Coordinates of C-alpha atoms and ligand atoms in Angstrom, one line a residue:
Chain Z
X1 CA -29.7 53.6 -53.8
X2 CA -32.2 55.4 -51.7
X3 CA -34.7 53.0 -51.9
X4 CA -34.9 52.1 -47.1
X5 CA -34.6 48.1 -47.5
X6 CA -37.0 45.6 -45.3
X7 CA -34.9 43.0 -43.1
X8 CA -37.8 39.9 -43.4
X9 CA -38.5 38.5 -40.2
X10 CA -37.9 35.1 -39.7
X11 CA -41.4 32.9 -38.2
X12 CA -42.0 29.9 -36.6
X13 CA -44.2 26.9 -36.9
Chain H
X1 CA -57.6 48.3 -18.3
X2 CA -56.6 45.0 -16.4
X3 CA -56.4 43.0 -19.1
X4 CA -53.2 40.8 -19.1
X5 CA -51.4 42.5 -22.3
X6 CA -47.8 40.5 -24.6
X7 CA -45.9 41.9 -25.7
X8 CA -42.9 41.0 -29.2
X9 CA -40.5 43.1 -30.4
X10 CA -38.2 42.4 -33.5
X11 CA -35.1 44.5 -33.5
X12 CA -33.4 44.1 -36.6
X13 CA -29.6 45.8 -36.1
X14 CA -26.6 47.4 -38.3
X15 CA -23.6 48.3 -36.6
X16 CA -21.5 49.7 -38.7
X17 CA -17.0 50.6 -37.5
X18 CA -14.9 53.2 -39.6
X19 CA -17.9 53.5 -41.9
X20 CA -18.9 50.5 -43.7
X21 CA -15.3 48.8 -43.6
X22 CA -17.0 46.7 -40.2
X23 CA -20.5 46.0 -40.0
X24 CA -22.1 43.0 -37.6
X25 CA -25.8 42.1 -38.2
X26 CA -27.9 41.1 -35.4
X27 CA -32.0 39.6 -36.0
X28 CA -33.4 39.4 -32.8
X29 CA -36.4 38.0 -31.4
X30 CA -38.1 38.9 -28.0
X31 CA -40.6 38.5 -25.8
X32 CA -42.3 41.5 -23.4
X33 CA -38.8 42.5 -23.0
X34 CA -36.9 39.1 -22.9
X35 CA -34.3 38.2 -25.7
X36 CA -34.5 34.8 -26.8
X37 CA -33.5 33.5 -29.6
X38 CA -30.9 35.6 -32.2
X39 CA -28.2 36.0 -35.4
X40 CA -25.5 37.0 -35.0
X41 CA -23.6 37.1 -37.8
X42 CA -20.3 37.1 -36.0
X43 CA -21.7 33.5 -35.9
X44 CA -24.2 32.9 -39.4
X45 CA -26.2 30.7 -37.0
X46 CA -30.1 31.3 -34.8
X47 CA -28.4 30.9 -30.7
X48 CA -30.8 30.2 -28.1
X49 CA -30.3 33.3 -25.6
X50 CA -33.4 31.6 -23.2
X51 CA -34.8 27.8 -22.8
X52 CA -38.1 30.3 -24.8
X53 CA -35.8 30.4 -27.2
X54 CA -34.5 26.8 -28.1
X55 CA -37.3 25.6 -31.0
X56 CA -36.7 28.7 -33.1
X57 CA -32.7 28.4 -33.5
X58 CA -33.6 25.0 -34.4
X59 CA -36.2 25.2 -36.5
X60 CA -35.0 28.4 -38.5
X61 CA -31.0 27.2 -38.5
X62 CA -32.6 23.6 -40.3
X63 CA -33.4 26.1 -43.1
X64 CA -29.8 26.6 -44.8
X65 CA -32.3 28.8 -47.1
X66 CA -33.6 31.5 -44.8
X67 CA -29.9 31.5 -43.1
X68 CA -28.6 33.0 -46.1
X69 CA -30.6 35.7 -46.1
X70 CA -29.2 36.5 -42.6
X71 CA -25.7 35.9 -43.7
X72 CA -25.9 38.2 -46.3
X73 CA -27.9 41.3 -45.0
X74 CA -24.7 42.8 -43.7
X75 CA -24.1 43.7 -47.4
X76 CA -27.7 43.3 -48.8
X77 CA -29.4 45.2 -45.7
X78 CA -26.5 46.9 -43.0
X79 CA -24.2 48.3 -46.1
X80 CA -27.1 49.0 -48.9
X81 CA -29.1 51.2 -46.2
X82 CA -25.8 52.7 -44.8
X83 CA -25.4 54.1 -48.4
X84 CA -29.2 55.0 -48.6
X85 CA -29.2 58.0 -45.4
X86 CA -25.2 58.3 -45.4
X87 CA -26.3 62.1 -46.9
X88 CA -28.7 63.0 -44.1
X89 CA -27.3 60.9 -40.6
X90 CA -23.8 59.6 -40.9
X91 CA -23.6 63.6 -42.3
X92 CA -25.7 65.3 -39.9
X93 CA -24.0 68.0 -38.3
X94 CA -25.7 70.8 -36.2
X95 CA -24.3 73.5 -34.8
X96 CA -24.5 74.7 -31.2
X97 CA -26.7 77.2 -29.9
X98 CA -24.7 78.8 -26.5
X99 CA -26.0 80.9 -24.1
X100 CA -24.9 81.5 -20.3
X101 CA -27.7 83.3 -17.8
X102 CA -27.1 83.6 -13.4
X103 CA -29.0 81.1 -11.1
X104 CA -29.6 79.9 -8.2
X105 CA -28.2 77.4 -6.1
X106 CA -31.1 78.3 -3.6
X107 CA -34.0 81.1 -5.1
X108 CA -33.5 83.5 -1.3
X109 CA -30.1 83.5 -2.0
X110 CA -28.0 85.9 -4.2
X111 CA -26.6 84.4 -8.0
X112 CA -24.0 81.5 -6.9
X113 CA -24.9 79.4 -10.1
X114 CA -23.7 80.1 -13.9
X115 CA -25.9 78.1 -16.3
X116 CA -23.3 77.4 -19.8
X117 CA -26.7 76.5 -21.8
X118 CA -25.7 74.8 -24.9
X119 CA -28.6 73.7 -27.8
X120 CA -29.5 72.2 -30.7
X121 CA -27.2 70.0 -31.6
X122 CA -26.3 66.9 -34.0
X123 CA -25.0 64.2 -32.6
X124 CA -24.1 63.6 -29.5
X125 CA -21.2 63.9 -28.1
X126 CA -20.3 66.8 -27.0
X127 CA -17.6 68.5 -24.4
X128 CA -18.4 71.8 -22.4
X129 CA -16.0 73.6 -19.8
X130 CA -16.0 75.7 -17.6
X131 CA -12.7 78.9 -17.2
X132 CA -12.7 81.8 -14.8
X133 CA -9.9 83.9 -15.8
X134 CA -9.1 81.6 -18.7
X135 CA -7.9 79.1 -15.9
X136 CA -10.3 76.1 -15.8
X137 CA -11.8 75.1 -13.3
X138 CA -13.2 72.1 -13.0
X139 CA -14.3 72.1 -9.3
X140 CA -18.2 73.2 -8.6
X141 CA -19.4 71.5 -12.1
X142 CA -22.8 69.9 -12.7
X143 CA -24.9 68.7 -15.9
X144 CA -27.9 67.5 -16.2
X145 CA -26.6 65.3 -19.0
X146 CA -26.9 65.4 -22.4
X147 CA -30.2 65.9 -23.3
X148 CA -32.4 63.8 -26.6
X149 CA -34.7 66.4 -27.6
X150 CA -37.1 63.5 -29.8
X151 CA -36.3 65.4 -33.0
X152 CA -32.0 65.3 -34.2
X153 CA -31.3 67.4 -32.1
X154 CA -29.6 67.4 -28.6
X155 CA -29.7 70.1 -24.8
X156 CA -27.4 70.0 -21.6
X157 CA -26.5 72.2 -19.3
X158 CA -23.4 72.7 -17.8
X159 CA -23.5 74.9 -14.5
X160 CA -20.6 76.3 -12.5
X161 CA -21.4 77.0 -8.9
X162 CA -19.9 79.9 -8.3
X163 CA -19.6 83.1 -6.1
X164 CA -18.8 86.2 -9.2
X165 CA -17.0 88.2 -7.9
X166 CA -17.0 92.4 -10.2
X167 CA -14.0 92.2 -13.0
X168 CA -13.9 88.4 -13.3
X169 CA -14.6 86.7 -16.5
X170 CA -16.3 83.4 -16.8
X171 CA -16.1 82.0 -20.2
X172 CA -18.5 78.9 -21.4
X173 CA -15.9 76.6 -23.5
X174 CA -17.6 74.6 -25.9
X175 CA -16.5 71.4 -28.7
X176 CA -18.1 69.6 -30.7
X177 CA -17.5 67.7 -34.5
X178 CA -19.8 70.3 -35.8
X179 CA -16.8 73.1 -35.2
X180 CA -14.4 73.8 -36.0
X181 CA -12.2 75.4 -32.7
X182 CA -13.6 75.5 -29.6
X183 CA -17.0 79.0 -29.3
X184 CA -17.0 80.5 -26.3
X185 CA -19.3 82.5 -24.5
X186 CA -18.0 85.1 -22.1
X187 CA -20.1 86.4 -18.7
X188 CA -19.2 88.7 -17.1
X189 CA -20.6 90.0 -13.2
Chain C
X1 CA -19.5 50.8 -32.8
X2 CA -19.3 54.7 -34.7
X3 CA -23.8 54.4 -35.7
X4 CA -26.1 52.1 -35.8
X5 CA -29.3 51.0 -37.4
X6 CA -32.3 49.4 -36.2
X7 CA -35.6 48.7 -37.5
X8 CA -37.8 48.2 -34.7
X9 CA -40.8 46.9 -34.8
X10 CA -43.4 45.2 -31.7
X11 CA -47.2 43.6 -32.1
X12 CA -49.3 43.6 -28.1
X13 CA -51.9 41.9 -27.7
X14 CA -55.1 42.5 -26.8
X15 CA -55.1 45.7 -28.6
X16 CA -53.1 44.6 -31.5
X17 CA -51.0 47.1 -31.7
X18 CA -48.4 47.7 -34.1
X19 CA -45.7 49.4 -34.8
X20 CA -42.3 49.6 -37.4
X21 CA -39.9 52.5 -37.2
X22 CA -36.0 52.5 -37.9
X23 CA -33.5 53.9 -35.7
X24 CA -30.6 55.3 -36.5
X25 CA -28.3 56.0 -33.7
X26 CA -31.2 56.4 -31.3
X27 CA -33.2 59.2 -33.5
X28 CA -35.7 58.3 -35.9
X29 CA -35.2 58.3 -38.9
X30 CA -39.2 57.3 -40.0
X31 CA -42.4 55.0 -38.6
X32 CA -45.1 53.4 -40.7
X33 CA -48.5 54.2 -39.8
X34 CA -50.6 51.3 -40.3
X35 CA -53.6 52.9 -41.2
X36 CA -52.8 54.6 -43.6
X37 CA -50.4 52.6 -44.3
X38 CA -47.8 55.6 -45.4
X39 CA -44.3 55.4 -45.0
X40 CA -44.0 59.1 -42.7
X41 CA -40.7 60.4 -42.3
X42 CA -39.9 62.4 -38.7
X43 CA -37.9 65.5 -40.4
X44 CA -39.4 66.3 -43.9
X45 CA -35.9 66.9 -45.4
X46 CA -35.2 62.6 -45.5
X47 CA -38.4 62.1 -47.6
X48 CA -35.9 64.0 -49.8
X49 CA -33.5 61.7 -50.1
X50 CA -34.9 58.2 -49.8
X51 CA -37.8 56.0 -49.6
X52 CA -39.5 53.1 -48.2
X53 CA -42.4 51.1 -49.6
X54 CA -44.9 51.1 -47.0
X55 CA -46.5 47.7 -47.6
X56 CA -43.4 45.9 -46.8
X57 CA -43.3 46.7 -42.8
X58 CA -47.5 45.2 -43.2
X59 CA -45.8 41.8 -44.0
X60 CA -43.3 41.7 -40.9
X61 CA -46.4 43.0 -38.6
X62 CA -48.0 39.5 -39.5
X63 CA -45.4 38.3 -38.9
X64 CA -45.4 39.6 -35.3
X65 CA -48.6 39.3 -34.6
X66 CA -48.5 35.6 -35.7
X67 CA -44.9 35.3 -33.0
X68 CA -47.0 36.4 -30.7
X69 CA -49.8 33.8 -30.7
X70 CA -47.4 31.2 -30.5
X71 CA -44.6 32.4 -27.8
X72 CA -47.7 33.4 -26.0
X73 CA -49.1 30.1 -25.4
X74 CA -44.9 28.3 -25.4
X75 CA -44.6 31.0 -22.4
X76 CA -48.1 29.1 -20.4
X77 CA -49.5 33.1 -21.3
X78 CA -47.0 34.4 -19.2
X79 CA -48.3 38.7 -19.1
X80 CA -45.9 41.0 -19.6
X81 CA -45.0 43.1 -15.6
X82 CA -45.9 46.3 -16.3
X83 CA -42.5 48.9 -15.4
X84 CA -44.2 52.8 -15.0
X85 CA -42.5 56.0 -16.9
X86 CA -39.8 58.3 -16.1
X87 CA -41.3 61.3 -17.3
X88 CA -39.8 64.9 -17.8
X89 CA -40.4 68.4 -18.6
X90 CA -38.4 70.0 -20.3
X91 CA -38.1 73.7 -23.1
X92 CA -36.0 73.4 -26.3
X93 CA -34.0 76.9 -25.7
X94 CA -33.3 78.8 -22.4
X95 CA -37.2 81.1 -21.9
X96 CA -37.5 83.8 -22.7
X97 CA -40.8 85.9 -22.2
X98 CA -42.9 86.8 -24.7
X99 CA -40.1 84.5 -27.7
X100 CA -42.0 81.7 -28.6
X101 CA -40.8 77.7 -27.3
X102 CA -41.7 74.6 -27.4
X103 CA -42.8 72.5 -23.7
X104 CA -40.8 68.9 -24.1
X105 CA -42.7 65.7 -22.3
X106 CA -40.0 63.1 -22.8
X107 CA -41.9 60.1 -21.7
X108 CA -38.8 57.2 -20.5
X109 CA -39.3 54.1 -19.4
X110 CA -41.7 51.9 -19.9
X111 CA -43.8 49.2 -20.9
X112 CA -45.8 48.0 -22.4
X113 CA -46.1 50.4 -25.6
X114 CA -49.2 52.0 -24.3
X115 CA -50.1 56.2 -22.6
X116 CA -52.6 58.6 -22.6
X117 CA -50.5 61.6 -22.6
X118 CA -52.3 65.4 -22.0
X119 CA -50.7 68.9 -21.9
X120 CA -52.6 71.2 -18.9
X121 CA -52.1 74.9 -19.4
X122 CA -53.6 76.3 -15.8
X123 CA -55.0 72.6 -14.9
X124 CA -57.0 72.4 -18.6
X125 CA -56.6 70.4 -21.8
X126 CA -54.7 71.6 -24.5
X127 CA -54.5 70.3 -27.4
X128 CA -53.4 73.2 -30.3
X129 CA -50.0 72.4 -31.9
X130 CA -49.2 69.7 -30.6
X131 CA -47.1 66.8 -31.1
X132 CA -45.8 63.6 -30.5
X133 CA -44.0 60.6 -31.0
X134 CA -44.3 57.5 -32.2
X135 CA -42.8 54.7 -29.0
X136 CA -39.3 54.0 -29.4
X137 CA -37.1 51.0 -28.7
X138 CA -34.7 51.4 -25.8
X139 CA -31.3 49.2 -25.7
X140 CA -32.9 48.2 -22.4
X141 CA -35.8 47.1 -24.7
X142 CA -38.7 49.2 -23.6
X143 CA -40.2 52.5 -24.9
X144 CA -39.2 55.7 -24.5
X145 CA -41.9 59.0 -25.9
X146 CA -41.5 62.7 -26.4
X147 CA -44.5 64.6 -26.8
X148 CA -44.5 68.0 -28.1
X149 CA -46.5 71.9 -27.0
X150 CA -45.7 75.0 -28.4
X151 CA -45.8 77.8 -25.6
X152 CA -45.3 81.7 -25.7
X153 CA -43.9 81.7 -22.4
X154 CA -45.6 84.1 -20.1
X155 CA -45.4 84.7 -15.9
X156 CA -49.4 83.9 -16.4
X157 CA -49.1 79.9 -17.5
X158 CA -48.5 77.1 -16.2
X159 CA -48.4 73.7 -17.8
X160 CA -48.5 70.2 -16.4
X161 CA -48.0 67.0 -19.2
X162 CA -49.2 64.5 -17.6
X163 CA -48.5 60.7 -17.6
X164 CA -51.6 57.9 -17.4
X165 CA -49.4 54.6 -18.0
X166 CA -50.9 50.8 -15.9
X167 CA -47.5 50.8 -14.3
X168 CA -48.7 53.8 -12.8
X169 CA -51.5 54.3 -9.1
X170 CA -52.4 57.8 -10.3
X171 CA -51.7 59.9 -13.2
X172 CA -47.9 61.2 -13.2
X173 CA -48.2 65.2 -13.8
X174 CA -44.6 66.7 -14.3
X175 CA -44.6 71.3 -14.0
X176 CA -43.3 74.1 -15.7
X177 CA -43.8 77.2 -14.9
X178 CA -40.9 80.2 -15.9
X179 CA -39.1 80.6 -13.3
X180 CA -37.7 83.4 -11.6
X181 CA -34.2 84.7 -12.5
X182 CA -33.1 81.6 -9.8
Ligands
LIG201 C1 -56.5 56.0 -21.5 O1 -57.5 56.5 -21.7 C2 -59.0 55.4 -22.0 C3 -59.4 55.6 -22.7 O2 -59.3 56.9 -22.6 C4 -58.4 53.2 -21.8 O3 -59.2 53.3 -22.4 C5 -60.6 52.0 -22.7 O4 -61.0 52.8 -23.3 C6 -62.1 52.0 -23.7 C7 -63.9 53.0 -24.1 O5 -63.1 53.6 -25.2 C8 -63.7 51.5 -22.1 O6 -64.4 51.3 -22.6 C9 -62.3 51.2 -21.6 O7 -62.6 51.2 -20.3 C10 -60.9 51.9 -20.4 N1 -59.9 51.3 -20.4 C11 -59.8 52.2 -19.3 C12 -60.7 53.0 -18.4 O8 -59.3 51.4 -18.0 C13 -57.4 53.7 -21.8 O9 -57.0 51.7 -20.8 C14 -55.9 54.3 -21.4 N2 -55.1 53.8 -21.1 C15 -53.7 53.5 -20.5 C16 -54.7 54.3 -19.3 O10 -52.7 53.8 -20.5
NAG202 C1 -10.8 52.0 -42.2 O1 -11.1 52.4 -43.3 C2 -10.0 52.5 -44.1 C3 -10.3 52.5 -45.8 O2 -11.6 52.6 -45.9 C4 -8.4 51.8 -44.0 O3 -8.0 52.2 -44.5 C5 -8.2 51.7 -42.5 O4 -7.3 51.2 -42.1 C6 -9.9 51.5 -41.4 N1 -9.1 51.7 -39.9 C7 -8.8 50.9 -39.3 C8 -8.6 49.4 -40.0 O5 -8.8 51.9 -38.3
NAG203 C1 -44.5 25.4 -19.4 O1 -45.6 24.5 -19.1 C2 -44.3 23.9 -19.1 C3 -45.6 22.7 -18.7 O2 -45.2 22.6 -17.0 C4 -43.8 23.4 -19.5 O3 -42.9 22.6 -19.2 C5 -42.4 24.9 -19.2 O4 -41.4 25.1 -18.7 C6 -43.5 26.0 -19.3 N1 -42.7 27.2 -19.9 C7 -42.6 28.4 -18.9 C8 -42.0 29.3 -19.5 O5 -42.9 28.3 -17.5

């Protein structure tokens, strides 16, 4: 693995 | 500019213990500097940290698919990203440059401070000790503390208040993960 | 912990400024330049061993903006309280006359993440070779920042780091000059 993974943001609605 | 400001922050945190044997993940949401809701992998659900975060806790906890993304994060996100940078973060070792020079507690006095300047090291944990004639001097020691340079190096100054006499040999000793034995620098009056 | 990795983001109104970065034990791995949509590695060598698709940060910042709207209303439009910075000026190495060194201006414990920073040499602004970090997260959820000025030490020149922040009544100046054997 060489690619940093993003942690998604939870959105309120 | 006196217009009011409003700040949202998010911090997705990965905490590692014993390599990647134990890993804890936090999904943290902030309004200004106030954390209002968080997912803790120890729990596996969001919990309101303040009353402000109750709606988000309830709403996000109602979405099982969303929760499963967060529940798997220690593996898919935390352990993964640790692996990605391990070689240049976890294994980064930069040894300190060590200098000793005299100084003054008050500028009009004769030299009565020995400065041990420890520069450019990584990671942060370091031990610096002063010796006079092979005996550790534990009195009169003051330091800047550990200082981040913001560029993946640290420094610290560790000063010994003392009146140098002829013949005396002072030694600054430095221990650090990058070293396999203590680094010593002598100073003579 | 042995180590902590944090993906830290913020979005600020009405400035409409957003930031996205990764932090490892309090140092920055990289951040995304929002305008250029490019990943900026804190140290050059980091980029040879890893990568990050900058596009991912944009999606996160979008959600941050949307959440801010929601929390702003939910709080009854309660604005942030300014917390002015502590400012320290140091060199990165022991100073020797005519030996290249770097002045560091450390700006710490402040919010919101907006400052104007100027280096002054003998009271005049200087920008040659200066550099800076983005806003870095603190565990108390305030911010810190570094500014850098390479210089050649002399008995002639004096320097100041001048910091402006909404929490300050007047600009904060932290001084540096050559120490004379003391
Ligand atoms: C930093 O300085 C800038 C200006 O140099 C301030 O931003 C505003 O700039 C616009 C045009 O560029 C003016 O119309 C505003 O009046 C400025 N705001 C002022 C003067 O308050 C900005 O506020 C400064 N940031 C600080 C001090 O944190
Ligand atoms: C650290 O990890 C090793 C193997 O990964 C394990 O054998 C050891 O018990 C761990 N240390 C602890 C749990 O203190
Ligand atoms: C906002 O106003 C409503 C209406 O009075 C109140 O119920 C709520 O507690 C307020 N929220 C905050 C964060 O002050």
